[PDB]
Amino acid sequence: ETNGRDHHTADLCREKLVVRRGQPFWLTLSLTFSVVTGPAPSQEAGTKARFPLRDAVEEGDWTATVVDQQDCTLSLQLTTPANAPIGLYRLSLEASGHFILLFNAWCPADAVYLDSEEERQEYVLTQQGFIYQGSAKFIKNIPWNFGQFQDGILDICLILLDVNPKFLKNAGRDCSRRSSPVYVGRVGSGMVNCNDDQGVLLGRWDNNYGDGVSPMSWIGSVDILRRWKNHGCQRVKYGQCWVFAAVACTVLRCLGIPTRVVTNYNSAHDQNSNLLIEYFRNEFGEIQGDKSEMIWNFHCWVESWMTRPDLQPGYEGWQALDPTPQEKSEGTYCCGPVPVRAIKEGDLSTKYDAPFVFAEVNADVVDWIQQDDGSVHKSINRSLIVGLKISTKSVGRDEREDITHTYKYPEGSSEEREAFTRANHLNKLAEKEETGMAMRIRVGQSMNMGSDFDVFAHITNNTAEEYVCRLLLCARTVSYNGILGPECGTKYLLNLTLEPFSEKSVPLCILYEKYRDCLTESNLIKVRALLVEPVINSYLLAERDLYLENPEIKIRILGEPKQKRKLVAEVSLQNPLPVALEGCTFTVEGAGLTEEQKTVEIPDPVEAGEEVKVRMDLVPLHMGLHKLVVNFESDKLKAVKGFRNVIIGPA
Amino acid sequence: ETNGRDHHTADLCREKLVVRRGQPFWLTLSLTFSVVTGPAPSQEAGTKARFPLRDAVEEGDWTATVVDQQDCTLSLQLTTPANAPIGLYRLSLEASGHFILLFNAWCPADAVYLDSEEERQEYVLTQQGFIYQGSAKFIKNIPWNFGQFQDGILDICLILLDVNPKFLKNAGRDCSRRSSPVYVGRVGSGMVNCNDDQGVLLGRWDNNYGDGVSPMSWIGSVDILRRWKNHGCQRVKYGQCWVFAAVACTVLRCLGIPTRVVTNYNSAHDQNSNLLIEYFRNEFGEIQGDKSEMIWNFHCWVESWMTRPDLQPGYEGWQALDPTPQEKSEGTYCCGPVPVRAIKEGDLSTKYDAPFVFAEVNADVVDWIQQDDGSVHKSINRSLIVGLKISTKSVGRDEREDITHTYKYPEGSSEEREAFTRANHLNKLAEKEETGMAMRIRVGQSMNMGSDFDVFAHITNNTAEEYVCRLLLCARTVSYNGILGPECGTKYLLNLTLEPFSEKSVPLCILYEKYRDCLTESNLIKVRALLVEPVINSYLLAERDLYLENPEIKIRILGEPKQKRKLVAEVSLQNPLPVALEGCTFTVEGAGLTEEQKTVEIPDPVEAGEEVKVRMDLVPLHMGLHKLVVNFESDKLKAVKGFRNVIIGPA
């Protein structure tokens, strides 16, 4: 067990040994040792090893040097190789139990070696985190309990590997190839939503999740992974991209591959890696429906840290893995791993799937306004820029780290030019037409889910001429992935006089009664404004995605935070709606604060102004920092999150 | 010592016992006990007590019931009264050592009882915090190490009490009256800056702090309190309001009185509690200098939690204590404690100093524009509102808690009307004149110390008429307390045409070359704008205080965070100036991470683009959460702060 403390697997080391490859582990008792892992072990396949109880050393692969011999006892040290395959091993010796071997971010020779402690702590050990959502212009951080070290998750991850397509075809090859984080990476990734029989989650995007758990409701990977195994490995209802990435992160972290979930705003996902996306809108600026895919408000994927021996030297580091399956050249599958640096450099020939990730982040959009006589005019749209605020949690702290710079060079820089050339993407001549006029959507201040509020189409005329235009404003609810719902606010002005060297601000009132019916749990509304000057026949387009704020969840920690001691969390919130909330339910969890997810229903409805308050009983079994993540659910106010860091010291 | 763990005084209990009143403490060995505290103890004065080693109990005051008698040993329990005076006590018994008694936030009967654990943890136990600075429109949180439990601070606080004016006049009364947190409160407060002989800090506000430590340089109370005692209790150079409040908070926390430092923006401090402040400006909007005090950009004071038996029932709770001496009716002294609820209610007759604090938060300002022929016109100024974002650190987390609601009822609410009536302050008829025109200062985006940037006078004409006005823009550096330095950007338009139903934005370029000479360490610049329409002869005034951002200090924690183990903190920053930095110096501290303040000078200058990086060696002796607070100093970039929460687990 003091191996746990040595291998950073302490929480995992309870009633079975679990260690990390490339590092020596204590064992206490001429004879020889033998290890076997797969269901068809073999010597050359690395899945089986025979080694003597020497006294010297001479590394190479597996060794078992002796250290002490306290008369009736015998202390020795087994050493696994830095590239030993991952999995369950059987340990037996000959005259004259089992351990689980994971990747080792701490071992210099391991392919997943992490140069610094804080990063190993964050990307492998810390079980709580954030998934960035909201909007490019108002980023929200959703708390999430990865809980990779929660009870039974490691066993589920091994089951997850042992049931993947490649293990079914040839269990022997699979177990052997599991020495490679890129190989394990592609498996973890494909098992999340792709591989439709044994897949972990079943995606659904239509806002109709009654017969399952809505994607926005999950507050951690643990419950998903459990519902999967406890129902014979059947897809859990339901997930969406951040959920896929989130459980993929949990699995990979459990297994020891440093991983972090990333969010990209204005993501050109599900376009066939196409770098020039065109939309055709009618005279009110409404995109003319069909087979065209909308830009996603945000899209999530994960990044895993490892070396890439299967590619040109120098591509070690972060590798982008997108477990959300997308339409590809020959089928619909997930993507990666591809080195992020390759994406930044425009090296699209690198495996795997470089052109897809490159597009998510660099695609170019053209908005056309179709008119009478089928004439088509290119509108100026300065509001849309693909690949916006690539975010992931900072190492060791709750602040958000912007990693956009790792995927892209500064706009219009020379290095950007190089990358775009290497990617056959020199399209960026910029129309710059500039009617001298500009326009953008302004919000003024934060709005809350449940309230009425004004937003504004803000026009700037930095010219000597006075224009007379028509301005078409339209606001409609949107799913996080682009699906537009019905209009929830419209306004047109047919004779807008824009004075010279001035600015005008036109308000658009958005009412709760108009957006309550179709707003998804992502709380997004998309405001659109089209300004057209009939003389020159110019079209100025501007759009913005608003995020309506949910009420905050107050969290009081009652009692002294000590290991193995009653802890009460009082959670509450105030109903923001002008009507009553029914079926209120608080849900809580967090690796380190409970082994079980806690739930508390509220029998009676919470009226319009009222607050709802309950107390959850916790029994924290671990010292150190842990995030208590909480979710609130009701009939008319869903998926409101909240969290609280709890320290918990010595008993 | 297990008393430490029982009395929440563990860090204090090393080589001398320290406990809290109103609660039993273990003691292990017909006889009777005796306790003496002052230098002139007495029975009725509560400073001396004689009590028998009973076997039953019968509380009342001091008791010494026996519990166990393991043959050669004897375990008993002394119990101090809930209102026992605070201090050093001598314990001796008769036939047939010493403890330090502090206030007890955990004891239901004590005057400082705190109803919940999280609040006791925050306001008494946590030794790290934030002091809000910056500007109403851009709040900055300065890290601060209170370190009330650092080695030797308790002894300094006792010295602090034993050398106060009231102890010099009659040591006997002083020691007795130290049973009252309000009494100890007034003492702690007065000793910080007021009482000029033995005062802790010497205030200075002229930006000339070469022969001492600048107020903005301090990163904790510890070093201040130490320099005080180690130089025979001589005022330390130099402090300002937040520093005074900060050390006052340290002392009060050490002593056990729950305390938190608060910041108020646009604070009408140092006006003689006057509720109607008037300024006379010339034709450019410049205030015409003299004896008039400027509104402070922000002002800080502390709040201590206690009951108020010396007043009408119901005034228990937070009490505002302002250790910054201000001009009063008869002399210049500090103020409070006054119940915050009394200030909210307008109950100005409550002791102590209610009308002063009431003014800080409620004063009304009138801006007059003097003209030719000595005619004076009242300008409309919607940009200034006194008492803005009363802030203090949240309990248990790093987020800022807005406590403005505790000092004031909503604007124009009925309760506000009541409070203003009880305070003879019904002045709020509102001019509402509204030329239909409005104006405010806009910033666009964050600017950094060291860069050039534009701000804007944003004019709104929601009228059918077209006006032709003159706009006078002026930007000047300012100290946090209102002291205007020389202008650093001006623009004067005499024929500004404002078109009907339009907005105009006029830029004012502020250059580093222009503000580098006089900017204070608070990084504040005050933009002013006066728009006058000559026809009706109307004056519109708008002002705003900008905060220039300092570069961030990156903090890497090298090694595993374990009790009693080498810990290396790598701190760095990137020079934001277009010129070189010389005399660079990093300073670090934090109760729980070092017993000593660490310093590291950088021999060579840091050039214009370059980064500076160094490593500090720490030896953390305590488990749990601790903030490592850091300060960077140099010739041309001063007082830049930074911090990092470090967890530190079992050895």
Ligand SMILES: Nc1nc2c(ncn2[C@@H]2O[C@H](COP(=O)(O)OP(=O)(O)O)[C@@H](O)[C@H]2O)c(=O)[nH]1
């Ligand atoms: N709730 C919410 N607040 C927003 C959103 N966008 C902006 N805000 C907030 O509204 C204020 C102004 O928005 P900002 O983007 O800074 O400027 P503006 O939109 O150009 O006026 C800021 O306090 C923002 O944090 C949004 O989508 N949702």
Ligand SMILES: Nc1nc2c(ncn2[C@@H]2O[C@H](COP(=O)(O)OP(=O)(O)O)[C@@H](O)[C@H]2O)c(=O)[nH]1
């Ligand atoms: N560094 C700095 N940033 C500021 C300051 N005031 C506002 N900002 C930031 O500038 C942006 C716009 O300012 P805001 O007050 O929201 O609106 P505006 O001033 O009316 O345009 C936001 O990102 C603010 O956080 C200031 O004094 N200093």
